[PDB]
Amino acid sequence: GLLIFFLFIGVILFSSAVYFAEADERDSQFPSIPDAFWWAVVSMTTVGYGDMVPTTIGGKIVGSLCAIAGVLTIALPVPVIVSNFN
Amino acid sequence: SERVVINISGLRFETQLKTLAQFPETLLGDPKKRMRYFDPLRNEYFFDRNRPSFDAILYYYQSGGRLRRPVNVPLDIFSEEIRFYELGEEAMEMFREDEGYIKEEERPLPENEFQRQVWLLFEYPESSGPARIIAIVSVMVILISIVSFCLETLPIFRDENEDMHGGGVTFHTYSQSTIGYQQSTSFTDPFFIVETLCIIWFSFEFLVRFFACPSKAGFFTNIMNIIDIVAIIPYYVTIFLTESNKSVLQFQNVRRVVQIFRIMRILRIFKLSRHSKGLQILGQTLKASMRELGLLIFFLFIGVILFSSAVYFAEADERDSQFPSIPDAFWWAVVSMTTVGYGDMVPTTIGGKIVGSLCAIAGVLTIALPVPVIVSNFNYFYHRET
Amino acid sequence: GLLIFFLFIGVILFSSAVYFAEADERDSQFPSIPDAFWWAVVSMTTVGYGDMVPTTIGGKIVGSLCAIAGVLTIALPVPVIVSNFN
């Protein structure tokens, strides 16, 4: 649950930031914050399909952080789970 | 029931004589052997030795055979004490096993002058300078056989033929496209030359090793020998097959088999495992990790089917669905769980994306569970060598 | 070096397999084995750009294994490195 919760926090923070950073663009791939959730989860889990990608400098900065925060976010709770399994 | 006092560098131990009499052939169990250490003034046997170790030595007699090394005592120091107290080879063997050891094999060339001498420069790179030279050539031939196998697929070479511009289709150009080279006694094709040379050498080693090894029975037991054999089978089998089907129609009928053996050629890559310590460790690791490796595949399998199914139905009522069926979605599920995410298949509906999100997370967890164990095994085998 | 070596072995095995599995296809994205190296490294490191993807069933089976083998391949030597750093 802690994993889901942290992921949830990150999804909302980055979806929000990428939305606004791409807002003043005619070719924005982010219609709304809720729509950007998909992009945020796809980036944090580092799956990166590429169906949604930021195009502005601010969007890419947000994107960069999103990827790194993802690795750390997931990395924190898993170890414990792996231990239990072990 | 008479009691015995053993003084280990000041540390006082006490036991019954019957407890020691249990193992007569040891130092403490044999009166004639311990006599030397008796102090008649204090009525005790005195040993100017390591203290932490004796606890376990005494417990060995009390337990009736349990020889456990104390956690706080170095294996090198404890082993010396086991030998000093003369506990015997059986106990020692039992001990090293538990401590994670044991293993000694490898006969030796009997036909001295000839065999034994050859089997040293074709099995032990350190036997002599010439031995090294040989091993080095093997790597050169292997690497070359690999580079050549790959270049056979380069368009610059294969697209330069008689049927290159979609014209007609010649039997000779057809089999050359399937096999990868031109099988002709005229050795015109440069790829057939290199391939033939390489196989001449691979055949050579295999032959030598066979007619120059101690036990020619436990030969096809060694995984290394299997590799050597598998590394040449394709060549000869291709020859046999093409000569047994020298006509267009016949070849067309045996092409699949020929193609399969062409793919098999790549296994020659593993011939390097005879010159790679790391590659051997990996082999030992995987061998020791079948249960977890299968567990990984199994869990992945479960996840693939669950998510493929869910994403299929979530995208089903859509005109632009990228998921034709559940089986087709397996690809998407594996690509997402391993987090590779090519993006050639992606859900477009809200339900599909929710399923997708979970799929990615479940993937990370799924893979993360069994790997650690595998990594441990590798780490063990890796260090228990370096 | 062990990492590079193992990766090298995997790259060649999977590039070869995916090449042949996609060979008898008009729309093959794999011109040759050497060209497929790129796809193999991109899959094993799990980067997956998607500029090269198998389209046949045999290619996808090869691809699946390639991804899994990648995770394991990289996972083996890193731990030691991480320890040294630590």
Swiss-Prot record, chain B:
Induction: Up-regulated in brain cortex in response to ischemia (at protein level). Down-regulated in dorsal root ganglion neurons after peripheral nerve injury (at protein level). Down-regulated in pulmonary artery myocytes in response to chronic moderate hypoxia. Changing R51A: Loss of channel activity. GO terms for cellular component: axon; axon initial segment; axon terminus; calyx of Held; dendrite; endoplasmic reticulum membrane; endosome; glutamatergic synapse. Disulfide bonds: none annotated. Changing S9A: No effect on channel opening. Detected in neurons in dorsal root ganglion. Detected in hippocampus neurons. Detected on neurons of the anteroventral cochlear nucleus. Detected in neurons of the medial nucleus of the trapezoid body. Detected in neurons in the brain cortex. Detected in axon tracts of the corpus callosum, specific terminal fields of the brain cortex neuropil, neurons in the medial entorhinal cortex, and in puncta representing mossy fiber terminals in the hippocampus mossy fiber tract; these puncta correspond to synapses made by dentate granule cells. The record marks T221 as: Important for normal, slow channel gating. A lipid is attached at C213 (S-palmitoyl cysteine). Residues 327-338, 339-346 dip into the membrane without crossing it. Changing T221R: Changes channel gating from a predominantly slow mode to a much more rapid mode. Glycans are attached at Q176. It is a multi-pass membrane protein. Changing Y380F: Nearly abolishes interaction with CTTN. Residues 277-290 are annotated as: S4-S5 linker. Phosphorylated on tyrosine residues; phosphorylation increases in response to ischemia. Phosphorylated on tyrosine residues by activated PTK2B/PYK2. Phosphorylation on tyrosine residues suppresses ion channel activity. Phosphorylated on tyrosine residues in response to CHRM1 activation; this abolishes interaction with CTTN. This is probably due to endocytosis of the phosphorylated channel subunits. Phosphorylated on serine residues in response to increased cAMP levels; phosphorylation is apparently not catalyzed by PKA. Changing E14A: Loss of channel activity. Belongs to the potassium channel family. A (Shaker) (TC 1.A.1.2) subfamily. Kv1.2/KCNA2 sub-subfamily. This is Potassium voltage-gated channel subfamily A member 2. The lineage of its organism: Eukaryota, Metazoa, Chordata, Craniata, Vertebrata. The chain holds residues 32 to 421 of 499 of the full protein.
